[PDB]
């Protein structure tokens, strides 16, 4: 195995395959990157046995086919540490990989390519392509609502749902829900899958922002995403995600509109004096007014009064302020609409000007 590649063209691939390869690995080979030269292409693979990252680098300079595994972080650091425009000459020399550029020389320990975990091939059941910005939006709009190490393991991931020409992301922790729908301009079959937390993080991480579209392929127990010459593959969460459609309030009688920033700032201030563990705040809704109150065990109290657009019956609803703030911070719009039923039923929060994302927050007592 031998190849010579320009640093700037090895960097992003190494960053995309080695970036997710973190911490003390289970097997030592998991801390390694599989390098394979074949057909004028260098393939770089990083794995954790569940999720896989494969990058393909075109070799426009002389090369010799072969394969080996090298410590990922050390190899990335060497290439990154080399100067701008550096030509990186790589060669396998026994049980060690040689890296040469200018007057810089490195000999890395190898582990056999044959010992590298090869993930079984699988058949894609649903596939579609979409802009990176659309995937970013779908994830960012709902990611915060995913559960954190919940016993209901299926809640620690994000649901990816296809229906007609829409791709939808759903995330819930059983207390609050986030749902984002985006039109994808391709007729899709009705499919629903749960992507694990780490797969979600990686899907976000792989989005460079650029012109490259993202090609998603979903199988029965795996998901793969292609962006340029990078292939991210993740196992799916084998579980049944709750039905978001049921969770959505049927026909709310009460509708409140407020400036997102004024509302956010009032909640952020009341949050300071709320219970550190329970984060409970009280909302008192009245004609064109919202009063937010918070108190903690040390009997400290916060009160905020805001002008809102509310034409309905006066009501008092309790909420975990963190859940509300998470929604208000995820919204990034001028005005928000809160759709309420009663004090013991969930609120739906959305951008007053858009129904693409909806946030359902169950109240407290």
């Amino acid at each position: 195995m031998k190849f010579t590649v320009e640093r700037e063209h090895l960097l992003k691939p190494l960053q995309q395959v080695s970036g997710p390869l973190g911490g003390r690995p289970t097997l030592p080979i998991l801390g390694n990157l599989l390098l394979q030269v074949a057909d004028g292409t260098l393939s770089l693979t990083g794995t954790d046995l569940e999720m896989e990252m494969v990058a393909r680098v075109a070799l426009v300079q002389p090369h010799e086919p072969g394969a080996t595994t090298v410590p990922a972080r050390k190899f990335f650091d060497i290439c990154r540490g080399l100067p701008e425009g550096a030509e990186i000459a790589v060669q396998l020399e026994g049980e060690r990989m040689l890296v040469r550029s200018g007057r810089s020389r490195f000999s890395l320990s190898t582990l056999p390519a044959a010992d590298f975990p090869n993930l079984d091939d699988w058949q894609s059941e649903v596939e579609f392509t979409l802009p990176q910005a659309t995937m970013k939006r779908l994830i960012e709009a709902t990611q915060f609502s995913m559960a954190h190490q919940d016993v209901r393991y299926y809640l620690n991931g994000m649901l990816f749902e296809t229906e007609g020409e829409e791709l939808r992301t759903v995330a819930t922790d059983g207390h609050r829900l986030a749902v984002c729908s985006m039109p994808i301009g391709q007729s899709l079959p009705s499919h629903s899958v749960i992507v694990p937390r780490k797969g979600v993080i990686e899907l976000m991480r792989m989005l460079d922002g650029g012109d490259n579209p993202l090609r998603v392929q979903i199988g029965s127990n795996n998901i793969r995403a292609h962006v340029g010459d990078f292939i991210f593959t993740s196992k799916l969460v084998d579980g049944r995600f709750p039905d978001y459609r049921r969770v959505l309030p049927k026909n709310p009688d009460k509708h409140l509109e407020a400036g997102c920033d004024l509302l956010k700032q009032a909640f952020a201030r009341a949050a300071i004096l709320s219970n550190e563990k329970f984060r409970g705040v009280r909302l008192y809704v009245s004609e064109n007014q919202l009063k937010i109150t918070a108190n903690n065990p040390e009997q400290e109290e916060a009160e905020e009064i805001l002008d809102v657009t509310y034409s309905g019956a006066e009501m008092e609803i309790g909420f975990n302020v963190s859940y509300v703030l998470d929604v208000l911070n995820a919204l990034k719009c001028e005005n928000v609409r809160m759709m309420l039923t009663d004090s013991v039923s969930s609120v739906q929060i959305e951008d007053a000007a858009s129904q693409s994302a909806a946030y359902v927050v169950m109240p407290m007592r």
């Binding site: 819930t172 059983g174 207390h175 609050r176 829900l177 709750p242 049921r246 969770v247 329970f278 975990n320 013991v344 969930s346 359902v360 169950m362 109240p363 407290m364 007592r365």
Partner: peptide, 5 residues
């Protein structure tokens, strides 16, 4: 804290 489901 009430639950959605």
């Amino acid at each position: 804290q009430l639950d959605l489901f």
